[PDB]
Subunit: 126 residues, 2 copies
């Protein structure tokens, strides 16, 4: 498979794919007779893991580490640890959003909601 095939299959652009290689986040593909990158199923799995990990919350570095763990013959407990930590991270984010949502709704309920200039929302946000 050439880089265009991988882009189509993974949904990643060829630039993003070259980027992942450039940052050593994935295994470097070998070169064909004419010098073009040749990809294997392993590359597809690494790029998929990278794309999906990101989509579910892991950042670049974290995603790169998951790829590292993936290629390792040997870490169920470890990956679980990383995953549960991601969950805790997301829950704190959910908690913060919920808090801001409730603060806005408390202010909104206090708002005259009319043509008067008096506004608790603006006054308490500034």
């Amino acid at each position: 498979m050439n880089i265009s095939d991988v882009a189509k299959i993974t949904g990643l652009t060829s630039k993003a794919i070259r980027f992942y290689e450039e940052k050593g986040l994935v295994t470097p593909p070998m070169r064909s007779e004419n010098g073009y990158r040749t990809y294997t199923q392993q590359h597809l799995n690494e790029l998929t893991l990278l794309r999906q990990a990101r989509q579910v919350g892991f950042n670049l570095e974290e995603s790169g580490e998951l790829v590292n763990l993936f290629n390792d013959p040997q870490h169920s407990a470890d990956v679980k640890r990383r995953t549960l930590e991601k969950v805790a991270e997301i829950e704190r984010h959910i908690e913060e959003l919920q808090s801001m949502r409730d603060q806005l709704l408390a202010l909104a309920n206090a708002c005259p909601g009319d043509d008067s200039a008096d506004c608790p929302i603006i006054e308490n946000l500034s």
Copy 2:
């Protein structure tokens, strides 16, 4: 007050304060006789509102409009309320998105001993 003092008081970096000025989202700072930026309580209020609006979820343009409404003696509270309820709906969507992400990670984790997590993500 100079920009350093404003940064400490507002909790914004000097970078951010200068950025808001460059974007025309805040009343420009004054220049002292020595040519350097000086600020008043008015600037503090606008920057505070700006900092808090961005934190709660308002983007740049929206935050700038809140600063305008703030400076408008004839502002209509109804307008601020409408904008606020619209932002709340957005936050709700964000929350739901995070909850589904969390649900998926916990599903993977539940299926794992001590790897279903890596096999499915890859």
